[PDB]
């Protein structure tokens, strides 16, 4: 409704301005902001190493799911870790941007669902065995990865 949208807008803005000062609106908001930052950083490290190969997947409606499935299964074959989970979000992101680029906007909503389902059915086990997302925030909050790279520079 109108009250819900105003509330949601107040919450989003306050969450942002709090995180700008090192605070957080809520534990969820802190996870979201650490994850965005880790995404930015993973994409920066990826693009410095390798070329953007998204176009080379040749996304189509018929192939979109199997493409997603195969990249993600290969990403987690050897095991799971926070960095690989960040890679999974980034790939989902690159996958959605490509879908819009190639005028298949509707795949964004489907890619989002494939991602949530994979999180529920295949990553949650490991996530709960490894401290939950609060532990992720402990490792990646305050833009930790980007700083760990800025140190070596």
């Amino acid at each position: 409704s109108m009250s819900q949208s105003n509330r949601e807008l107040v919450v989003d803005f306050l969450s942002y301005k709090l995180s700008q000062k090192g605070y957080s609106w809520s534990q969820m908001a802190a996870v979201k902001q650490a994850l965005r930052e880790a995404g930015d950083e993973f994409e920066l490290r990826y693009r410095r190493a390798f070329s953007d190969l998204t176009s080379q997947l040749h996304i189509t409606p018929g192939t979109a799911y199997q493409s997603f499935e195969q990249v993600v299964n290969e990403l987690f074959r050897d095991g799971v870790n926070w960095g690989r989970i960040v890679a999974f979000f980034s790939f989902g992101g690159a996958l959605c941007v490509e879908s819009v680029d190639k005028e298949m906007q509707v795949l964004v909503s489907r890619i989002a669902a494939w991602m949530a389902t994979y999180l529920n059915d295949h990553l949650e086990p490991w996530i709960q065995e490894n401290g939950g997302w609060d532990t992720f925030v402990e490792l990646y909050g305050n833009n930790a990865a980007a700083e760990s790279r800025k140190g070596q520079e």
Binding site: A38, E41, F42, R45, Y46, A49, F50, L53, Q56, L57, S67, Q70, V71, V72, N73, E74, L75, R77, D78, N81, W82, G83, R84, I85, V86, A87, F88, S90, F91, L139, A144, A145, S148
Partner: peptide
Amino acid sequence: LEPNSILGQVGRLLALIGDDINRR
């Protein structure tokens, strides 16, 4: 592994960078 599996390749490249970002 297989050279035509651009999809497996991308997964492995993601893994490599994922491992790198996971190092502290």
